[PDB]
Amino acid sequence: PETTEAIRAVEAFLNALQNEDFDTVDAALGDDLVYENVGFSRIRGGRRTATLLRRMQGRVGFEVKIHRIGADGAAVLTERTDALIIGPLRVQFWVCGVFEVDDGRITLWRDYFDVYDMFKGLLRGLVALVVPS
Amino acid sequence: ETPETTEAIRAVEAFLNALQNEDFDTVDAALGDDLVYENVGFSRIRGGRRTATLLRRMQGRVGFEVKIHRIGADGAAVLTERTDALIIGPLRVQFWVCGVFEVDDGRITLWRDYFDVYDMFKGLLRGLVALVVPSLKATL
Amino acid sequence: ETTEAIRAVEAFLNALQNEDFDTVDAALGDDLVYENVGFSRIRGGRRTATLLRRMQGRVGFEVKIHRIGADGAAVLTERTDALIIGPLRVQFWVCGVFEVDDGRITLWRDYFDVYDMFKGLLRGLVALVVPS
Amino acid sequence: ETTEAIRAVEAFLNALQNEDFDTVDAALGDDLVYENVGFSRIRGGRRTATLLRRMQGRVGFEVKIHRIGADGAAVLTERTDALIIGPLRVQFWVCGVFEVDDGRITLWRDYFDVYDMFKGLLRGLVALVVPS
Amino acid sequence: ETPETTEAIRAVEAFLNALQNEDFDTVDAALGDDLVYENVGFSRIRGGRRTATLLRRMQGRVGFEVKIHRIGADGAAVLTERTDALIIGPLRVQFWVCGVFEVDDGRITLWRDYFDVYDMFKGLLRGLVALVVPSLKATL
Amino acid sequence: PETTEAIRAVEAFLNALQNEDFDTVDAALGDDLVYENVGFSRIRGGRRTATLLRRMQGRVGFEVKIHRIGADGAAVLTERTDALIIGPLRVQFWVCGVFEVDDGRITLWRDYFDVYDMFKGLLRGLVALVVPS
Ligand SMILES: [Ca+2]
Ligand SMILES: [Ca+2]
Ligand SMILES: [Ca+2]
Ligand SMILES: [Ca+2]
């Protein structure tokens, strides 16, 4: 089932990110990956993205929580809560991700999020840094 | 025996075309009595009828366009990658939206639209610029 | 090889008719080009497969293959197809040409005639009122 | 057998294009049924052969075969044909199905689309005025 | 290089349709200056122009129908198996004709029609009967 | 050449009649022959026609002269002068014949002629019987 397959590849990928399983991250990313944080960044190349993420371990941690996930042929859509963690600072924000997978490899990774939501997440992180809650 | 999955996708597509087309009786039929409608971070409304007549009353003041790029389902949940546009006379404001829906028995019980204020602000600036230079107006 | 390509095409067309959409998925290549000649072109096997899957319960298909031959990876068919939308049945001839690579369909090209389809429509509309 | 049937069909279609009417005669079975689907049916190989022979100098034919496969005695073709009447050239797709028995064609069934043919006509008429 | 055989057949067909259609300029172009025209056992006329204007002058008095069942050529000679009809108002007289032609350079130099007085007499009786019982009138 | 073939079969047949070559007549006639003298007679069956003609030798002779002959697919048309000969009486008259040939065999033989022309032929025959010319 090619649908189920695409879904699992995306789930395996996002779990790998969260778990710092960087060999799985490498295996999951297509050579011609385009990776967009929409309105903010674009990177081309699975390998360049894979090594960039690998080089972030120990300075920024990632959490990903997938609330909903569905497929449309080769595309997979996600509704998530993500968090960047830099030492004691935790920045949480919603993310909707769209992916394209081809033969078990991710060829498009496109994350949408809101600067207002992200800003609130930052304020909450910073406040929590002096009131651990 | 056609799966609830195909049904749910189709209900959401029918609903979004109905909004764009101003087909308010289909909008009425599409929305469950206990609808919760969220523009994430901005508004929450409860109740299909209250939302349905709110939308109906916008006719002639603000038009909507919806272009769905990708849509898929997770049981009763439906996810959507779109470009939307709000039109107020000659001003057109275009922005991306990701919507998540829940459908129960052909009726929409959750409608949750996600967007970015930055992207929206950029859409507004382009709308405003196009008011003066009709050539820079966004299109679907 | 030849028989293989023929069987893939038959299996695919029967799966369409039977609404066996996993099999439809498995039959179509990633780089499928799908044409209704003069009318539509779609690229991608996943896209085509999910488009067909999503028609279930709105349009049914029937396919009768009268003749089917092969030349290497190419398979040609002479068929009668029908589209079914509720009580409305529209029947019309189709000649389909396919290319199959490794059990997967990489080209699917259906030819038909608007005049023949128009007549099928009239007959279908008449049949709505005189079920016979 | 299979190759035999394919070669008879190719030889026949090339003979048509080349106006080699004895070969056209030799290719067609006595009990040929010849159909242009939705449009014409003629029975008899001699009748069909002399009808084609008698068009020489009034209508020319061109046939390009893109794909050709066989299933036993049946041969299917995907083609581009053209009818040529003086400076007017009308080009259109044809899918032809044939049956061959003992080197002779016993069925010749051409399928085409009126919309595609209409477009070919417009293009031909336009070309009369803008030769390009 | 299309054979004189196909040409000759076509000239004869064009000529006979021209008679039926009253297309008298094609009739004029079709008939050679030294035409000999025979209804075998009944009439001989010499000269394409004299025959052409004779035929032209029959317009509105006697109509012709021609149905060719078989036609074939022997070099410049063309043979024809037909059913003809002469129409004079409501009277229609139908009979078989075998015609032999010779064509030289697209022009008809010999036109020789064969028929049977008996068959013609039968055609006349049926014509006359059909005048009174319109249902028994011959058709092509 | 199937055209040439049909023509020759008809020529061979009409020559055979004239020459009383009755085995050739037999070979030339199809089992399902229809034989018409138009307006006058119809017979079905190659064999019945072949034997009828065979049974005429010694009482009526036939002459056939083909002026023109042509083909239209399987059909062959003829313009002829024929003559029936009964002892010293010779009856001459024009005949146009149409034939259909299938696989070298004649399946349709249809002769057209005129009773007026035939009557004149009879008078001329009878007159010649007292004035041998
Ligand atoms: Ca972790
Ligand atoms: Ca794949
Ligand atoms: Ca003799
Ligand atoms: Ca034969």
D9 close contact with C: CB closer than 8 A: no
User: Which candidate, C108, E83, D25, places its Cα nearest to that of F74?
Assistant: D25
Q: CB–CB of D57 and E9 under 8 A?
A: no
Structure tokens at E94: 């139908």
Name residue, tokens 């966004």.
Answer: B138
* DSSP secondary structure of chain B: ---HHHHHHHHHHHHHHHHHHT-HHHHHHHEEEEEEEEETTTEEEE-HHHHHHHHHTTTTT-EEEEEEEEEEEETTEEEEEEEEEEEETTEEEEEEEEEEEEEETTEEEEEEEE--HHHHHHHHHHHHHHTTSGGG----
Neighbouring C-beta atoms of residue B64, cutoff 10 Å: 15
**C28-36 and B107-114 as β-strands: parallel, antiparallel, unpaired?**
unpaired
Alpha helices of chain F — where are they, by DSSP H? 2-19, 22-28, 46-54, 115-130
CA distance C94 to chain D (A): 9
Tell me the residue type at A1.
P
**Type and span of the H or E element at E92:** strand E91-104
| Residue ranges of E strands in chain A | 29-37, 41-44, 61-72, 75-86, 89-102, 105-112
Q: Is B105 exposed, middle or buried (0-12, 13-18, 19+ CB in 10 A)?
A: exposed
Cα F132 to ligand 3 centre (Å):
20
Query: Which tokens sit at C124?
Result: 């279908």
Closest CA to A107 of A72, A76, A70, A67: A76
Please, which chains are in contact with D (at least 3 CB pairs closer than 8 A)? C, E, F
| Residues on chain D touching E6 (C-beta within 8 angstroms) | 53-54, 56-57
CATH classification number, F1-133, choose in 2.40.50.140, 2.40.70.10, 3.10.450.50, 1.10.287.370: 3.10.450.50
Residue E124 CA: distances (Å) to CA of C20, E40, E82, E94, E95: 72, 19, 17, 8, 9
Q: Which of C68, C111, C116 sits opposite D38 (nearest CB)?
A: C116
Catalytic annotation on D71? no
CATH 3.10.20.30 fits E1-140, yes or no: no
How far apart CA C61 and CA C55 sit, in angstroms, is 10
CA torsion through residues B92, B93, B96, B99, sign: negative
Experimental method: X-ray
Residue from F10, F40, D45 nearest E79 by CA: F10
Q: Do C114 and D112 touch (CB under 8 A)?
A: no
* A74/C25 touch (CB, cutoff 8 Å), yes or no: no
- State how far Cα A6 lies from the chain centre: 16
- Cα–Cα distance, B100 to B39 (Å, whole number): 11
Contact predicate D97/C104, CB 8 Å: no
The separation between the first and the last C-alpha atoms of chain D, rounded to the nearest angstrom, is: 43
Question: Could you tell me the two tokens for E73?
Answer: 């050529």
* DSSP tag of C130: S
Q: How many cross-chain Cβ pairs, D to F, lie less than 8 Å apart?
A: 20
> In terms of C-beta density within 10 A (0-12 exposed, 13-18 middle, 19 or more buried), how is residue D96 classed?
buried
Which residues, other chains included, contact B121 with Cβ-Cβ below 8 Å and sequence gap of 6+? none
* Parallel/antiparallel/unpaired status of strands A29-37 and A105-112: parallel
Contact D110, D96 (CB under 8 A): yes
R_g over Cα of chain E: 15
Q: Of B4, B17, B1, give the one whose Cα is nearest residue B102.
A: B4
B positions 104-133 inside 8 Å of C (CB): none
State both tokens at D46.
């001699």
> Does F96 contact E at CB distance below 8 Å?
yes
DSSP D63: E
**In the structure encoding, which two tokens stand for residue A109, read together?**
């990774």
A61-72 and A41-44: which strand pairing?
Answer: unpaired
Q: Which two tokens stand for residue D68?
A: 């050709």
* Amino acid present at F5: E
Angle (CA) D65 D93 C88, round 5°: 130
3-class secondary-structure state, position F9: helix
Q: Specify whether domain D1-132 bears CATH 3.10.450.50.
A: yes
Q: Which of B118, B125, B126 to mutate to test the interface with A (most CBs of A within 10 A)?
A: B118
Q: Give the Å distances, CA to CA, from F103 to B126, C97, F47.
A: 83, 38, 17
Cβ count within 10 A of residue F59 = 9
How far is residue B65's CA from residue B139's CA, in Å, rounded to a whole number? 10
CB contact residues (below 8 A), chain C span 39-78, against chain D: 67-71, 74-78
Task: With CB atoms and an 8 Å threshold, state whether D46 touches F2.
Answer: yes
Cα of E111 vs its chain's centroid, Å: 9
* Residues 6 or more apart in contact with residue D18 via CB below 8 angstroms: none
Q: Which ligand lies nearest the alpha carbon of D30?
A: 4
Residues 6+ positions from B7 with CB-CB distance below 8 Å: B103, B106, C57
User: Chain F residues with CB inside 8 Å of D25's CB?
Assistant: 1-3
Tally of CB atoms within 10 A around C122: 11
Residue of D nearest to E10 (CA): D54
Tokens of A7: 């879904």
Cα separations in angstroms, B67 against A68, A96, B94, B99, B139: 21, 17, 11, 12, 10
Q: Which residues of C94-106 are buried (b: 16+ CB within 10 A; e: fewer)?
A: bbbbbbbeeebbb
Q: How many helices (H) and strands (E) does chain A have?
A: 4, 6
Dihedral-angle region of residue C110 (phi above 0 means left; psi in -120 to 50 means alpha; beta otherwise): beta
* Residue E13 near residue E82, CB atoms below 8 Å: no
Put simply, whether D86 touches E (Cβ < 8 Å) is: no
d(CA B47, CA A103): 43
Dihedral Cα B25, B10, A11, A36, nearest 10 deg: -70
Catalytic option among F26, F103, F111, F117:
F111
Residues of chain A with Cβ-Cβ distance to B80 below 8 Å are 77
Cα F18 to Cα F16: distance, rounded to the nearest angstrom = 5
Q: Are C99 and C4 in contact (CB under 8 A)?
A: no
How far apart are the C-alpha atoms of F66 and F14, rounded to whole Å?
9
CA-CA-CA-CA dihedral for F9, F13, F14, F16, to nearest 10: 140
Which of chain D's residues have a Cβ under 8 Å away from the Cβ of E7? 57
Write the Ramachandran bin of D79: left for phi over 0, alpha for psi from -120 to 50, otherwise beta.
beta
The bridge status of strand A105-112 relative to strand B31-39 is unpaired
Phi/psi of residue D20, each to 5°? Answer: -95, 85
Q: State which residues have CB under 5 angstroms from ligand 4, the bound ion.
A: D 30; F 103
Taking an 8 Å cut-off on Cβ atoms, the answer to whether A115 and B117 are in contact is yes
Nearest ligand by distance to the CA of C104: 2
> Which residues of B are catalytic, by number?
84, 113
Cα distances from F56 to residues D53, F19, F59, F60, F105, in angstroms, run: 41, 13, 6, 6, 22
Query: What strand order describes the sheet that includes B91-104?
Result: A41-44, A29-37, A105-112, A89-102, A75-86, A61-72, B63-74, B77-88, B91-104, B107-114, B31-39, B43-46
* Reduced 3-state DSSP string for C64-104: EEEEEEEECCEEEEEEEEEEEECCEEEEEEEEEEEEEECCE
E10/D54 Cβ within 8 A: yes
The alpha carbon dihedral of B127, B129, B130, B136 has a sign of negative
Cβ–Cβ under 8 Å, residues D116 and D98: no
Greatest extent of chain C over all pairs of C-alpha atoms, in Å: 48
In sequence order, the 6+-apart residues with CB closer than 8 A to the CB of A31 are A45, A46, A47, A105
Tokens of C108: 């699917």
Distance in angstroms (rounded) separating the CA atoms of residues C116 and C94: 10
User: CB atoms < 10 A from the CB of E54, how many?
Assistant: 12
How many angstroms separate the alpha carbon of residue E100 from the centre of ligand 4? 27
Q: Closest ligand to C30 CA? A: 2
| Residue closest to B16 by CA, chosen among B74, B88, B69, B60 | B69
Q: Please tell me the number of the ligand nearest to residue F65's CA.
A: 3
Q: Please answer yes or no on whether F69 and E74 come within 8 Å at the CB atom.
A: yes
In whole angstroms, give the CA distance from residue D127 to residue D119: 12
What residues contact A20, with CB distance under 8 A and at least 6 apart? A57, A61
Q: How far apart are CA C20 and CA C25, in angstroms?
A: 9
The rounded distance, in Å, linking the Cα atoms of E19 and D130 is: 38
Distance from CA of D25 to the nearest CA of F (A): 7
Contact D30 F102 (CB under 8 A): yes
For residues E140 and E123, is the Cβ–Cβ distance under 8 A?
no
Question: How close is the nearest chain E Cα to the Cα of D46, in Å?
Answer: 13
- Strand segments, DSSP code E, in D10-73 are 28-36, 40-43, 60-71
